[PDB]
């Protein structure tokens, strides 16, 4: 396989696990882990709705969601003293960039 | 001449406070609420159902899972290094 590939498989495994046992099934009190990815659901929303704010605004918050997170896991991962870095492949961060 | 017949017409005061619509839901609220709840999500014994109880708990802010989750990606890479080298 290519080592591309498989980063880019170990973060989306990462990003499953955020949202699949941080929290306890939903609970609505709300879990130490599951507070964090309510802190970064408001900090999002407050910002895209500060920024596209409009008449639409929520119709770009996936798209700037998943930007988001995408780039949050990915400065984590690449910084992992043994990992093979997807965004120091430059390439495919300025490719995304030139597509948006 | 005769009293009349307002005092015994009781049928909008049945919703002629507010508390009837907060009634006509917490009769249905409570009442299909349980005793305690259906189960809070901490293991089920996947074998990583068990990760999730012994670190993902409700109150388990302790970064240990942070820790050996990190460990692991540090294990992972570590050995792709003599895969390529």
Request: aromatic fraction near 14%; avoid cysteine.
């Amino acid at each position: 396989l290519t080592t591309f590939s498989l980063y880019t498989i170990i973060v989306l495994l990462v990003i499953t696990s955020l949202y699949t046992l941080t929290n306890n099934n939903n609970k609505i009190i709300g879990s130490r882990w599951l507070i964090s990815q309510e802190a970064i659901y408001d900090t999002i929303m407050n910002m895209t709705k500060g920024q596209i704010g409009g008449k639409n605004w929520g119709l770009y918050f996936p798209m700037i969601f998943t930007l988001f997170m995408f780039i949050f896991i990915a400065n984590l991962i690449s910084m992992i003293p043994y990992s093979f870095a997807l965004s120091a492949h430059l390439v495919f961060i300025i490719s995304l960039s030139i597509v948006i | 001449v005769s009293t009349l017949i307002p005092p015994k017409v009781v049928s909008s005061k049945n919703i002629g406070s507010a508390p009837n619509a907060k009634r006509i839901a917490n009769v249905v609220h409570f009442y299909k609420s349980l005793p305690q709840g259906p189960a809070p999500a901490i293991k089920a014994n996947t074998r990583l159902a068990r990760y999730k109880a012994k670190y993902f708990d409700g109150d388990n802010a302790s970064g240990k899972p942070l820790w050996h989750f990190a460990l692991g990606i540090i294990a992972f890479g570590y050995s792709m290094e003599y895969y390529f080298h």
